[PDB]
Design a binder for these strands. Structure first.
Ligand SMILES: [Ca+2]
Ligand SMILES: [Ca+2]
Length: 314
DNA sequence: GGTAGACCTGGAC
DNA sequence: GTCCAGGTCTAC
């Protein structure tokens, strides 16, 4: 059918594949795992969301990642469009090589890895990432998802409508920094997060030199980037690490939340050796990130994603 | 320098 | 009805 969300069966000629075995990527273990909060499984095994300013639907078979895009006459995705998809999933980073290494250095990762293959990091937009995670504060993945889409519906560009879903592009800096945005976000249920969204939008635009400041962080060192990000209102150590890891190409960045504390304790009998505190605190959190980084290497943030994800299923 | 308490809320046990 | 989720900010 010409309407509604597509499916591999439904509209055969509208899809194009990207070679990709399930061992290198698993949508159901990545898309709803707290990295991006903008993907939904409309029909079973089919995920629809905004990717590179367009709406896509993705579904995978054992060796292929099937993609379809909604923009002109309907048609399969072009090689360039598909390239953007390959880019978003950083398919050039070989998950098999990373899992192997992590496995040989961490007997525990080995055990968990066997059952949770295909977990990788998405290369996200700094702006979308920065604001989505500002909303992470004392919040669960479902509530976060709700806030973010409401935020996008209210200040994001209208893209296309499939069934009763009107997809929106992520709001721009200028839009989020607009008069009365906070008040609006509060009526949307973001709570005290409304304030930080507005504050950070204005901060970047009226104090840091704008969008470029954020984007230039991809060329900066992990340390510089993380240091810079913490300046923004509502952006602490954890949020900045998420941004570094998920959007600034800092693969060693390890977000330390309660989840990783439970993992560190239960699975590694970890204890803080520096800080004198027995639980989560700025100094012990820093210490843990260094513990994982020392344990897994340069792509510790990635290894972190595999366990965080596995810890969510449970 | 290293804590405790304030800040919002929808789904839980 | 108290509890919990990918926290952060700041006053003592
Ligand atoms: Ca929490
Ligand atoms: Ca800050």
């Amino acid at each position: 059918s010409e309407f509604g969300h597509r499916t591999l069966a439904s509209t055969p000629a509208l899809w194009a594949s990207i070679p990709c075995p399930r061992s290198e990527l698993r949508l159901d273990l990545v898309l709803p795992s707290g990295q991006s909060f903008r993907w939904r499984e409309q029909s079973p095994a089919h995920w629809s969301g905004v990717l590179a300013d367009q709406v896509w639907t993705l579904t995978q078979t054992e060796e292929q990642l099937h993609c379809t895009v909604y923009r002109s006459q309907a048609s399969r995705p072009t090689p360039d469009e598909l390239e953007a998809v390959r880019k978003y999933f950083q398919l050039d980073v070989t998950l098999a090589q990373l899992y192997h290494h992590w496995g040989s250095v961490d007997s525990h990762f080995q055990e968990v890895a066997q059952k949770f293959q295909g977990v990788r990091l998405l290369r996200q937009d700094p702006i979308e990432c920065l604001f989505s995670f500002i909303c992470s504060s004392c919040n669960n993945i479902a509530r976060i998802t709700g806030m973010v889409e409401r935020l996008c519906q209210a200040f994001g560009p209208r893209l296309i409508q499939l069934d009763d879903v009107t997809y929106h592009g992520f709001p721009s800096l200028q839009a989020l920094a607009g008069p009365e945005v906070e008040a609006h976000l509060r009526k949307l249920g973001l709570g005290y997060r409304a304030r930080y969204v507005s504050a950070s939008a204005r901060a970047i635009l009226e104090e840091q030199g704008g969008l470029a400041w954020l984007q230039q962080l991809r060329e900066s060192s992990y340390e510089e980037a993380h240091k810079a990000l913490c300046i923004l209102p509502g952006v602490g150590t954890q949020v900045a690490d998420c941004i570094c890891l998920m959007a600034l190409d800092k693969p060693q960045a390890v977000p330390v939340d309660v989840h990783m504390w439970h993992i560190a304790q239960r699975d590694y009998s970890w204890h803080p050796t520096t800080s004198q505190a027995k639980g989560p605190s700025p100094q012990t959190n820093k210490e843990l990130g260094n513990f994982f980084r020392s344990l897994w290497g340069p792509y510790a943030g990635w290894a972190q994603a595999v366990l965080f994800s596995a810890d969510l299923r449970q």
